[PDB]
């Protein structure tokens, strides 16, 4: 899984949920959008 | 349950029909005479001293003679104490024979291996030899470069060095028994076991899971 420093407002449709103590980003308004950051 | 002390008398082959050779080790097991049973007004644990031998009447010493005197007028040369598991033993019963293996024919064997003196630096440690020509001389079987420059800068533990070798304990867990004869003191086992002819060993019914 690729690693980044932030998610930087990439799409407003994202809820930015915490799962198991880390952020999990998922989106419907942008394809292939998956991020472990908030 | 317990173990037996024997005498390794050689190796041979017994075949099958029409072929396959079936190599087998030949062992003689004179019935182990018993010297002591514990948890019977002696010690807090269940164990038997199985003993084999008798020594010579003008060579046996007082501290050994008086240690076998509870069991008889012969110094049985050793105790061989085994703790009891999945069974029982009492102070009355026949001297322990190869009928221990009448139905349990998978065993494990403990004994000392390769009693062959010093061997040699390469004959022991399986090194790669240097060039016999091409300008190389004086070095061929010496142990080699024993480390590396400055940073670790020391000789390691768990490495290969010369000394007096062999006659140390090995345990074999995959063995099947081919035949036993309690009336002729015979044990016949498939394949090979540690130590040369005359070796004593320990043979036990298998307890491995």
């Amino acid at each position: 899984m690729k690693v980044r420093a932030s998610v930087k407002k990439l799409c407003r449709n994202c809820k930015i949920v915490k799962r198991d103590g880390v952020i999990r980003v998922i989106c419907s308004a942008e394809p292939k959008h998956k991020q472990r950051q908030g | 349950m317990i173990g037996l002390v024997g005498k390794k008398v050689g190796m041979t082959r017994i075949f099958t029909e029409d072929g396959v050779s079936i190599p087998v080790t030949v062992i003689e097991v004179e019935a182990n005479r018993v010297t002591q049973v514990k948890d019977l007004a002696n010690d807090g644990y269940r164990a038997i001293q199985v003993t084999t031998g008798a020594k010579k009447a003008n060579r046996v010493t007082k501290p050994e003679a008086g240690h076998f005197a509870k069991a008889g007028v012969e110094a049985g040369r050793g105790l061989w104490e085994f703790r009891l598991a999945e069974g029982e033993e009492f102070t009355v019963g026949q001297s322990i024979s190869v009928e221990l293996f009448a139905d349990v024919k998978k065993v494990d064997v403990t004994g000392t291996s390769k009693g062959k003196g010093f061997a040699g630096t390469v004959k022991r440690w399986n090194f790669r030899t240097q060039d016999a020509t091409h300008g190389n001389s004086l070095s061929h079987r010496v142990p080699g470069s024993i480390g590396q420059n400055q940073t670790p800068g020391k000789v390691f533990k768990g490495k290969k060095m010369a000394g007096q070798m062999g006659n140390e304990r090995v345990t074999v867990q995959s063995l099947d028994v081919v035949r036993v004869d309690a009336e002729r003191n015979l044990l016949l086992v498939k394949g090979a076991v540690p130590g040369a002819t005359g070796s004593d060993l320990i043979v036990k019914p298998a307890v491995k899971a």
């Binding site: - | 670790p152 020391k154 390691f156 533990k157 768990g158």
Partner: protein, 71 residues
């Protein structure tokens, strides 16, 4: 915690947790740490010989016999 220790075999090192130390080394986890705060020189060994820590509420001193230290 980590409790790093050199076994005497080159870079060979052991590590533990405080959970593991009380689960399988409860008499030794204090023994390896108190010696580093005894006096310097031969008096350190002379005080360490008096330490004798036990766990599981049972000792070899039932006729000496150790009484409770109180204020």
């Amino acid at each position: 915690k980590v409790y790093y220790h050199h076994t005497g075999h080159i870079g060979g090192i052991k590590q533990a947790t405080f959970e593991e130390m009380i689960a399988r080394r409860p008499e030794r986890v204090i023994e390896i740490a108190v010696k580093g705060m005894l006096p310097k020189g031969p008096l350190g060994r002379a005080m360490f010989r008096k330490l004798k820590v036990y766990a599981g509420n049972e000792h070899n001193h039932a006729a000496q016999q150790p009484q409770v230290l109180d204020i």
